Amino acid sequence: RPIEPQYQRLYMSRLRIRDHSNKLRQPMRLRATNADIGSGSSSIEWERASNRKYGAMLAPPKRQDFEFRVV
Amino acid sequence: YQELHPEEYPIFMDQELPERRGLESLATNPSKRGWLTRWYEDSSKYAHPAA
Amino acid sequence: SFNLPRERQILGGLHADWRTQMKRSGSILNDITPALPDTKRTEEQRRRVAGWRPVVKLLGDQRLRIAIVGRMNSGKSSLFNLLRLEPTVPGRSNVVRDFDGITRDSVEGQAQLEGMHFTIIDTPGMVQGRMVEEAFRTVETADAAIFVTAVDEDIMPEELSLMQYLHLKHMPVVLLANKMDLIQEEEEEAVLDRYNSLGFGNAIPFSARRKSGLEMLAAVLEPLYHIHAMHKVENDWDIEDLAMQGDESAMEEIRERNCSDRFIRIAIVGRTNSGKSSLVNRLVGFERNRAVDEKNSTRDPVELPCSYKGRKLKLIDTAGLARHRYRADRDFIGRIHGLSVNEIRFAHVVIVVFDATEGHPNKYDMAVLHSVAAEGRPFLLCANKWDAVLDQSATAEAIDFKIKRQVREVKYSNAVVVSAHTGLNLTLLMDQALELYDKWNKRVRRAELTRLWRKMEKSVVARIGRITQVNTRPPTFLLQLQTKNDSNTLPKALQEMMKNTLVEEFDFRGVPIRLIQEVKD
Amino acid sequence: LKLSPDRTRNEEIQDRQNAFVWSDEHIFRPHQHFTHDPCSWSRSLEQSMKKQRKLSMVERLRSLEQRQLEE
Amino acid sequence: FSTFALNPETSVAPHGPPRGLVNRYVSMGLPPWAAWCNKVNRYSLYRMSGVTQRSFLPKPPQEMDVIWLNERVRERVRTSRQVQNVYRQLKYPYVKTGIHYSDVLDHWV
Amino acid sequence: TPMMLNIQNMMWWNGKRNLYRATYREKTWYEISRTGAFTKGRRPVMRQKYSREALQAALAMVPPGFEVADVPRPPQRILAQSEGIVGRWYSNYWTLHSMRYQCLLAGVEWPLGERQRPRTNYDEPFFFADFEESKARRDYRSRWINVN
Amino acid sequence: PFKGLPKPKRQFGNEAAEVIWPYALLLERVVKVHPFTKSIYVYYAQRQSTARGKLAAEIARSFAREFLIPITFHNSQVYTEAEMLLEYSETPWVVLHSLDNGQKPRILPVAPVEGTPAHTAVEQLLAEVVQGCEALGASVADPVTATRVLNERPLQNQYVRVDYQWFGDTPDERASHLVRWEFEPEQIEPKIRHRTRHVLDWLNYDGNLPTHRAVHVNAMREKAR
Amino acid sequence: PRNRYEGKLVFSPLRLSKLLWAIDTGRINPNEVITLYHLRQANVVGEREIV
Amino acid sequence: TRKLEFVVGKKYPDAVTCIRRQRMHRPPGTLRHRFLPVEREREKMDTLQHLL
RNA sequence: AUUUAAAUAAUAUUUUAAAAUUUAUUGAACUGUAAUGUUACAGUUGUAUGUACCAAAUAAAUAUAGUAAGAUUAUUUUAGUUGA
């Protein structure tokens, strides 16, 4: 059942407060989505960073090497 | 990443197979036309290591 | 040639298994201590135990005695607590856990299945493949035995040896399988076939969680109950016929007066290593319980009926009381502390043991004494290890100083020195306990109370005109206030002074007293 | 509220709810074995729960029986 | 049967730390359960990695009269009963007066 | 102890400094923390790109009776650097495999061998001793069986 | 020393199962056979009339005692057994089964060459047995069903009375010198009242938690002293 | 609810109508086997939605 | 109470109310009260026995 | 996953003032002791006081400034409710 509109407004305000001058900017989502996760990597400075692009953290871990030691 | 940036890989780097979740859901799913359906259905690979 | 030295990967000497790390951590996490093996009894110790004498007579329960035996985690404690039913001491539940050897000492309690009243005994599980001497004694005393086994663990050479021992001793034993809810029909067939081929006979299925087999178990025991009743009545007829001797006449007198009277619950309390188990062993005349140097030697209360000087009673030993600081870290010992407190709350007399080697009772000892006083049980204080303490006079002076410094009725508590190994003043301790119970049940005259109050008023708010003793077991006095203002009660200092006066005059020395402020209406 | 119980509240609830046995709570005539199964879903779930665990005793007995049969 | 027990057929969603995080901790060289920490940032990861030794000696190397081969004073940290606060305490090695006998000197030293 | 007490002793803040620290730190804690610049995650390690003749000369100077399996991968707490052909480069794990990749790119035949030998069928020897307990787990047959 | 393990078969040829096996010997003898192999049964005779028969029986006994328990230990899905028959004979044999119940078991005799050392004879017999197992596994029909049966089959090496000397009793102790990525999140996840508290106590790292006021007071007192 | 745990398969939508519109306009060649790389190069999708 | 009055007022606006404020929320006149203090929770059983 | 949008931008958030507390340091020329004007002892503190505000002095700091308070720079204006 939907939460009370007052509390929903309070939470949406807490999401809005990030950028207040820009009225065109839609409020932040409760849970991050693909576009929000990928925008940072899409930016140019991150566009060059190949290790953080296309959901690198979201994807499951890479297979470790045949021989692996930590000492 | 390799598919989106083939320029950076002059040679076909060994492609790791997906995880167990991927194998169960998509890669080896006849309904989804998983690209590993044929490999999963094969039997010689279970028959002998050589195959 | 080109190789690196072998070396551990995880740094700091840690372990990849949080369970291994937990067991390394220890007490704060694993509160339950491991199984206690049989103690090393020397030849001299055996000789001294043989030389001991029983200061009280242990009574053989006339009802059928049935003992449950088997390996650890076999469901024996669960079956025991399902069968048992205590109408007089609620909260007597044996500790049950998934660990091994949780039951430290043998326990006994009255149980009934289908209107058949008998006494059932739980014994510690096999440890090192050799049951403890207390378990052997209890099994031998018991009239019948139920050997309980689980299905998630195949039979073991320890169980085979126990079965052979029971066969050698000719103990009538019935085989039960207590975890049949974890097994399926096809596997049930095989396990039941193995149990049948064992040699005893058709193993009765049972499941403690499902409470299945209780109705079936009763049918198996009913022949034993009937034959035991026949033997009991035969013994009674023989006693009646041979009463002319005099010893049998005295036995008949005992067996009549025990029914004509009611048992008095004497509960022994103390810290983990006070020596209450040794004290009860000395009192009963042998090592019914087990005493070890380990702090928390026993984890469950034990009750032993017995008669002292022709007065029935049930001597009770408790696990031990620990401070909240320790209990919070180790809740489990907190559980056994709660179990002990439950029995203290229902005892008719309480005896607090404190090791004399310490030199004087501890603050926690005084706390326990005040707790029993508040509960309203005649409290007695006993200094143990008196044969080991060095400065007897200094220890006695310290004990007396502590008692005097105590503020409430505990100030009147009587301290007695008792030694287990040597066995000193045990008869005096029992006599004092009986005297305390008599004072507890003592009665006072209304005229005497009124005259005493009048004299006190002349000797030293709203006055009172009528004082009477309403209750009997805990002596409670009702004092009526000559005012209709419901909040104009008496000062706590005044009521404490009145209680002290009553204790001093009517000899309620080791007995707590209660007062009720009543207003007219 | 229980200080050191072997069974948590959920475990106690499970133990009390599993005490129910339709076999004792009702009767079942032979003709019904071929046309009716009151304990279908619950009994299937119970059998699956039993399968979840693996009993060393029964496994060893079955393995020994199979070894004897092989010869 | 009981509805308070998860059905064997049902599969609850994964909740604990993922294989990626556990692999990061293992690569750092810690047990998998070491992934259970109240809070962790880049600096905390560097601190708990162990590549840097946070120990010391009572006196500088040119003044330490006692023979400390590799033992150093180390502070151990213990959380309170509530995880809100932590207390630290320094620990020193077991200094035993070695009364040895040297063949060359022929006399106990 | 100031560090235990969490006292901010910094020369530019209060003119003080803890006495248990080191006066010179070659690389700050952030530099130590950044591992991608220290390990072989994605970064190339040998910047030299030799020609076919140079690769052949390197393989010639490599001594006989040497296999790639004889050079274990260095642990993670060791800098992943690939020196040139300065000396016995075949000892350096990263330089060896970087030269292997360069030879693969250039079409130069690689005689040293593979890092791991896949044993497809059951052939001699039939019994082997592995006191390190790694060969049995790493066996291709075992991996194949587990996957199946 | 070890309790709860199943009791090994008490045949006259199954002395290896009863004898305690040091872990060093098992590590030295590591034999891998096709897991579709189900059971290996070596059968030899107590006494042999002919000298060649006696040699064959001797090499069969040596092969059993040496490479029978190791096969079971290192496969965990193969039941290996040896039996001595109170009967004259000169042709000891080996019976190989497979997870396919429809597959006829294979019989491999012992055929010693004119003259060779015991070590060479045992090695040749082991090679022949391994080749036979591989051929049987390859010829098994319905390999998918065979693999399912392999998954469903229990471990047959539970009766081996191994003796770990210095490697460690637990698998973690034995593999302490290796990194194990094959962990289960559910198993590793600590399950205790304060798992974070206990983890931080175990490994001395503060979860960015403030120091204790008691510690501050003690430190100030020490500074004063 | 709807927790994006690591390894969860949360695919970004790709409207079949959008793909057909791209083909009709001419940014995607029907004669070739379409792939995510081809879509990216044709610019029918942006880097924001390539997770 | 607040809950009852608000529910009835906001749902049944034309709801009549029958109350005597003088004797509402008070005990009857033929009722006597006795608040007995107890030094500790243990004395409560003895007080109850005395009352009975 | 039957099934309609969009200008990917982030950095900020009055001002003055809490009995503050924290870190480090100095002061026995005043005062209070012991010693015979001088010496020795000092802020989890020396003997009412420790240099004309003893919760001392000096140096550093912008603590839940919030549920203290005060101040807050741009007249000629152009639309809804005045105790719910």
Ligand SMILES: Nc1nc2c(ncn2[C@@H]2O[C@H](COP(=O)(O)OP(=O)(O)OP(=O)(O)O)[C@@H](O)[C@H]2O)c(=O)[nH]1
């Ligand atoms: N499935 C199932 N489990 C049971 C049953 N009865 C007991 N258990 C389990 O067995 C464990 C052992 O508990 P107890 O039988 O009470 O312990 P005990 O009988 O005193 O054995 P010891 O502690 O070694 O002396 C308990 O934690 C229960 O979880 C049963 O009927 N069915």
Ligand SMILES: Nc1nc2c(ncn2[C@@H]2O[C@H](COP(=O)(O)OP(=O)(O)OP(=O)(O)O)[C@@H](O)[C@H]2O)c(=O)[nH]1
């Ligand atoms: N020398 C001596 N020691 C005694 C005496 N009475 C008790 N003890 C001590 O009590 C120890 C045995 O422990 P227990 O008798 O079981 O008493 P406990 O430690 O409290 O055990 P539980 O009450 O069952 O928890 C012995 O090691 C003795 O040191 C005594 O009269 N003389």
